[PDB]
Amino acid sequence: DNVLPVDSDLSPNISTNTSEPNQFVQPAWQIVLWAAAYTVIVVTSVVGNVVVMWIILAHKRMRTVTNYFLVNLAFAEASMAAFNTVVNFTYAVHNEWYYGLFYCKFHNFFPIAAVFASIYSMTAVAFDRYMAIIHPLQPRLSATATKVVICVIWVLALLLAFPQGYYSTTETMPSRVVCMIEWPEHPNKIYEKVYHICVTVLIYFLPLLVIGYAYTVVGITLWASEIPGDSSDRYHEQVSAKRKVVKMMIVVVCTFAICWLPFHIFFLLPYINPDLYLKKFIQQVYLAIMWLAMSSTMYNPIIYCCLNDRFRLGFKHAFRCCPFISAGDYEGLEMKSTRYLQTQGSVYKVSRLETTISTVVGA
Template structure:
C-alpha cells in the first residue's frame, strides 16, 4: 500500500560508475537523530492506538448493555484500527527509514494486503453507523437492526474488504537487489489498460471518496432534522433529553468522520500523484514528506478512543474504570457504564411517585364510599330520601371506578414511556 515501495524499478537506490565498476548507494539514508525522532513519533501512535482501541473493545464486550447497533460497529472500527496500528505502523516506519525489507516474503504479502482491508472495514463501519443514525432519526417508527443482522453486516464488510485487497496480496513479491531486499508489488502489464493505475484509482474511490460522500449526505439530513427544527414550546423534559442524547451521538460520529477524512486526505493525494507523476518522487526530500503523510494517516487509529472518552459519558465511565489504578485518573461512577443514567432514575422515580399517588387517591375515595354507605344504613330513610342516598353511593362508586381506570391508564402510559426511553437509551 506504500507508493514509495510498490515498484519493481526500486528508484530509491542510485547507481554511479567508478573505476572498479558499478556502485550502489542509498540516497535516502537519514542521520540517527532524525530516525530517533521519527521512531518516538510512530511509537506513540502504536501505544495510544492499541491501548485505547483495546479498551474500547473491552468496554463494549464486557458490558451487555453496551452491545447496541452503533457500538457493534464501533467495536469493528476499534478492532480494525488496533490491528492496523499493531501489525503495520512499525513495519511501515522501518521500511520507510531503512528502505530495506527484513521480514520475509510471507509478511510482505500481509503488509501490502492488510492495510487496505483494515481501512475499508474502518470507513464502512462508520458508513454503517451513519446510515443507522439516518434511519433511526428520519424514520423512527421503522424497526432497527437486530444484533444478529448487525453481525451479518460486519461480516459482509470484512468479506468485501478482503476481496478488494486481494490483488495486492496476489501480486506481492520480494526481490534481492545488490546489498538489500525489497518488498514490492509486481503488477501485470496489459496492452489494453494500465491495471495498476486503474486499481489504485478504484481503491481511492471505494475506501475514501465514495463513503465520505454517503456519510456527508446522511449526516447533513440528520443534522438539519436534529438542529434546524425547533423544539415545541410545550415539549416535555423527556423529549428534550432524548433529542439532546441523539444530538450527542451524531455530534460524536461527525467528529470521528471528519478526523478520518483530514488524516487520510494527504495520503490519498500523495498516493494518486505517485501513479500519475512518478518522476517527482525521485527527489531526496520526498522521504520526509512521505514519513509525515504516513504518520498523519496512521495517527487516525489513535484519535477515536480519545473522542469517545471526551464526548460520550458511558465510554468515559468505562475508561475511568479501566484506568482507575492510575493516580491521575479521577474516580468516576461505574453506574454510568451500565446505562443507569439520570434519565433512567428520573423515569423510575416518576413511575414510583405516580403509583403512590394512584394508591393514595384510590384509598381516600374508598374510605369516602364506606362512610356514605354507613350513613345510609344509620338514617334508614324512606321514599325519595332512601333513593337519593342509594343513588349517591352509586355515583361515588362510579367515580371511583372511573378514576381508577383513568389512573391505571395513566400509570400504563408512564410505564410504556419508561420502557420506550429505556430502550431508546440502550440504542443510543
C-alpha cells in the same frame, strides 16, 4: 528522478528496500525518529483501543447497535497497533524491508484492509445515524444484522485489499518500510494503472462521498444544537442524548478525513505523474502522510472520552477495579437502571420501558 525507490540512482547508491538500509534516502536519525513515533504509538493505540473494546463488552449497558460498529472500528485499530505498527517499527530501525517481498505483501495487505474497513465502517455509522434520526421505530433494526453488516464491510474491504495479492499491483512507500499499492509504475504485466484508479475512487472516495451525503441529510434533522437538558429544542432526553452521539460520530469522521485524505490525494497525484516530482516528489512527502494515517488509530479513544460522558464514566468504572465512580456518574444511563458494568451497576435484566418492551432489552 526516480529509480525503483523515490530517489534517483544518479549514483549507484540506490539499493532495494528489500536488500539494504535506505540510509541514502534520509538521515539515519530520521529512521530512528520514525521508529520512535511508532513505538509510542503502539502503546497508545493498544491501550486506548483495548479500553474501548473492553469497556463496551464489559459494561452491559453499552449495548447499542452503534457500539457494535465502534467495536469494529476499535478492532481495526487494534490490528494496526498489533499487526501493522510492529512490522513498520522493525523496519524503521532496520532502515529497510528485512522481511522481503513476501512480507511487503503481508504488511501491505493487512494495513490496507484496515484503512478500507474503517472508512466503510464509518459509512455504515452514517447511514445508521440517518436511520435513527428519521425513523425512530426501533423494531426495524436488529443486532444480529449489525454483526452481519460488520462482516460484510470486512468482505468488501477484502475486495480491495485482497486483489493486490491476486496478480495485481504491489510495493514499499517512500523512505520506506511501509508497503502500499503501486502508484509509481505501471508494471504492465501487473495491470497497475487500472487497479489504482479503481481502488482509490471505489474504496476511499465513494464511501467518503456517501458519508458526506448522509451527513447532509442529518443536517436537516438533528443538528449540532443540542441543549444539555432534555428540555429545549429536544423532544425527550433520549432525543437529546442522541444528538451527543451524532456529534461524536461527526468528529470521528472529521479526524479520519484529515488523517487519511492527504495520503489518498498523494496516492492519485503520483499516479498521474509518476517518475516526476509533485511539489517535490520525495521520500519525505509520501512517508509523512502514510505514517500520519497510522496516527488515526490512536485518535478515536481520545475523542470518545472527551465526547461522551457515558463512556467516560463507564470507563472510569473499569479503570478503578472497584466502582469508585465519583465525579457525578453518568447522571443518566450510566446504565439504564443505574450504574452500568459487567457487574456492579449494570443490574441483570436492565429495566424495560413501556408496557411492552420498547427496546430489545430485558429480553
